[PDB]
Antibody, heavy 226, light 214 residues
Framework: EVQLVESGGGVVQPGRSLRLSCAAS????????MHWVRQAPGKGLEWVAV????????YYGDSVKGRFTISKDNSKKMVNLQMDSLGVEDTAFYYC???????????????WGQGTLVTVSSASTKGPSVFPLAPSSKSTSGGTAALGCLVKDYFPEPVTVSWNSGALTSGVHTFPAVLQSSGLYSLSSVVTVPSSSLGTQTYICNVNHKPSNTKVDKKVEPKSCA | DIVMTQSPGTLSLSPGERATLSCRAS??????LGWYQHKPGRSPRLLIF???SRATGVPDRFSGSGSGTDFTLTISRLEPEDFAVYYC?????????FGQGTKVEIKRTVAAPSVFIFPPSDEQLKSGTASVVCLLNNFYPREAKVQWKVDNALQSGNSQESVTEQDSKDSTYSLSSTLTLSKADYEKHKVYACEVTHQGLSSPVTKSFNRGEC
């Protein structure tokens, strides 16, 4: 089974450099033109570069021309992408991919890697502050209520949220994070639940942030007002 | 240099329906055209290469046609697994540019959002900040307008929105809007409200609370 595996991803400060690597499993490499493609959060696919089957020629996308270098080491059986003078806009998932030869260029890109996240930021690795989004902010009575967790100001790659250690999945909405003006991330995880269960059933959100190796379990209760 | 233009931006269709996606090139691309499928947390997938050729394992319901500057990807029968984002890519020029993508989504009946407002927690206020959350749960279509009003004054530049991805079981979307303020600014006002406008609402829906008052 043919595969491509990217490595070298992670956090880099704007103005610095990062080198991405790509390793071929089960095939040639030496007879294929190899590409890099990226996808920035909320944007579409963007072609980055290509290195000829030969290693003789290179082509780059307009936004990376001058800053990036694609190369091939047939001895180490690797494809590299040297990214210099990185900016916050270079934050994306990067894929290593194989071209289908065709004519004087390519007909398509058939084999792709899993991708690797490159976060270009000067922020410091910080664990989230977990705040409750307490249920029935007015009335309870009849049926169905909403509650959740505000997972605020973290800096990583991602966070994972689960409810009641994975036992509550039904009616859960964990939202895509937003990058705030501070350079920190924030998200909400909400769950719709029967109103009758609010007094009896315990709702805990399990926030795990691997980059700062922090684990938070916040219990979400209706706000006792007096 | 070669601009790839895909149309439409979104295609709202039911499973079993025929989907026809367009890709236009700014100049002739002669056979140097590929079509890709992209699912939220997955790698892009080659569907068609060399305008017309089906990649390995691509079902025959997918077909590519066209020439020069005008290309089409036809999915003859939309199966539930074909609801994805589709890109075309050109290899005819210097820089192998992609189109912006066409999202193919499940058309379903109009569903109005259930709307919920959450005031900032006491834990958060103790930190010096205040976030007010407006949740719009299980609505369709995707298009919705959220407006924050603070003591009846319309807010701008201090809220951020997030949408979930069409739900596997019911084909709806959920939206979260967060109004962020300092504890200082939050304490300067009483009424916090989000007003929701959606096709499924006969009139906009407003959810409010007064600061302090539970």
């Amino acid at each position: 089974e043919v595969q491509l595996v990217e490595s070298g991803g992670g956090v880099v400060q704007p103005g610095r450099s990062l080198r991405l690597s790509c390793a071929a499993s089960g095939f040639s490499f030496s007879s294929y033109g190899m590409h890099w493609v990226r996808q920035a959060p909320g944007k579409g696919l963007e072609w980055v570069a290509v290195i000829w089957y030969d290693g003789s020629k290179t082509y780059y996308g307009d936004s990376v021309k001058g800053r990036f270098t694609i190369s091939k080491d047939n001895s180490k059986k690797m494809v590299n992408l040297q990214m210099d003078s990185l900016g916050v806009e270079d934050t994306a998932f990067y894929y290593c991919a194989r071209g289908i030869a065709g004519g004087w260029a390519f007909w398509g890109i058939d084999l792709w890697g899993q991708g690797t996240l490159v976060t270009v930021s000067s922020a410091s690795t910080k664990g989230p502050s977990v705040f409750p989004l307490a249920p029935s902010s007015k009335s309870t009575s009849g049926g169905t209520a909403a509650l959740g967790c505000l997972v605020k100001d973290y800096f990583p790659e991602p966070v994972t949220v689960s409810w009641n250690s994975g036992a509550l999945t039904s009616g859960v909405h964990t939202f895509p994070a937003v990058l705030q003006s501070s350079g920190l991330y924030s998200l909400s995880s909400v769950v719709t639940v029967p109103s009758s269960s609010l007094g009896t059933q315990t709702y805990i959100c399990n926030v795990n942030h691997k980059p700062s190796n922090t684990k938070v379990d916040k219990k979400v209760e209706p706000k006792s007002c007096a | 240099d070669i601009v790839m233009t895909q149309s439409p931006g979104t295609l709202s269709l039911s499973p079993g329906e025929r989907a026809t996606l367009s890709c236009r090139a700014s100049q002739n691309v002669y056979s140097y055209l590929g079509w890709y499928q992209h699912k939220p947390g997955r790698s892009p997938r080659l569907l068609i290469f060399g305008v017309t050729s089906r990649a390995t394992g691509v079902p025959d319901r997918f077909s590519g046609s066209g020439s020069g500057t005008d290309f089409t990807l036809t999915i003859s029968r939309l199966e539930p697994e074909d609801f994805a984002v589709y890109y075309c890519q050109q290899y005819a020029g210097s820089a192998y540019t992609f189109g912006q993508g066409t999202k193919v989504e499940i058309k379903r009946t109009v569903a109005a959002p259930s709307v919920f407002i959450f005031p900032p927690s006491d834990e958060q206020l103790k930190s010096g900040t205040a976030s007010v959350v407006c949740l719009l749960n299980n609505f369709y279509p995707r298009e919705a307008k959220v407006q924050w009003k603070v003591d009846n004054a319309l807010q701008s530049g201090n809220s951020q929105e997030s949408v979930t991805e069409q739900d596997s079981k019911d084909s709806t979307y959920s939206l979260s809007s967060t109004l962020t303020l300092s504890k200082a600014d939050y304490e300067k006002h009483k009424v916090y409200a989000c007003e929701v406008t959606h096709q499924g609402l006969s009139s906009p829906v407003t959810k409010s609370f007064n600061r302090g008052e539970c």
